[PDB]
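URGENT: need a sanity check before tomorrow's submission.

F., can you look over the Esterase/lipase record below? I want to be sure the sequence and structure line up before it goes out.
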Amino acid sequence: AGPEIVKLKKILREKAVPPGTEVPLDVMRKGMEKVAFKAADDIQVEQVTVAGCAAEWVRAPGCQAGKAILYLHGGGYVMGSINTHRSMVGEISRASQAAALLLDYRLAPEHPFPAAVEDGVAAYRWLLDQGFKPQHLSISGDSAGGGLVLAVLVSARDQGLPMPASAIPISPWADMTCTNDSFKTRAEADPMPGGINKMAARYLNGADAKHPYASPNFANLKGLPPLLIHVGRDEVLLDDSIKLDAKAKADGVKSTLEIWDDMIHVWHAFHPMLPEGKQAIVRVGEFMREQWAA
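Structure tokens as predicted:
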């Protein structure tokens, strides 16, 4: 284990709210906003509106004309924004030499499932309408946002939309039942989970937790484009990614799973102080670019 991850783990444990204290949603939202990394100052940004949602085009230096990432941010379907994610997304734009469309999709409990999926589908539709070719498109996202990547592809496929060249779920939450072994197995190693059930409850609002667009580990994934799945060994959501990968394989989908030893939930987001964070982002961009050559 690098010294950075050890130090980051320690920091994350100090700051965590003890297990079981109920933090109000508005407190969690504001906290997440207040601690958001500022994006690199060579990242520029352009505010647009897409499918009735605020979005930003997030363009690092070196972007290729004609290419785009639909980016779907994490936050358990209940929090996160353009602000919480602009930094990391700017580094994914840098690594993939493509502009990212960062969508402020509708969040539960105000807008429960399937609002976020409708927003992602419509955003993808918007990109095709703007004239981006599907073979020039990628979709990526972290945590809740990473399951939503898969939910969007499935829903889009069902609606006759063409698939993009690739998809990169980062630490995807793709199974709202939260029953996988790793919630027990990886819980000690994970400094980042009865709070994950509250999110699920807020998102679902009574809907089937095995609904394909809520929990794409139960969806038919046939026809989806090549996947890169990043997950940390040291995370409660390990099993979501292992099982996602197996599902995709079974379903005929080209899938590459990288389990990064010693890594935590969306360790990418800590790229400013974590060498592996930077490395994993460079890898995401490498894969998007590889898939854009094939």
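My own read: The beta strands are 44-50, 53-59, 68-72, 99-103, 137-142, 166-170, 227-232, 255-260. Residues 177 and 209 are 6 Å apart (CA to CA). If you see anything odd, call me.
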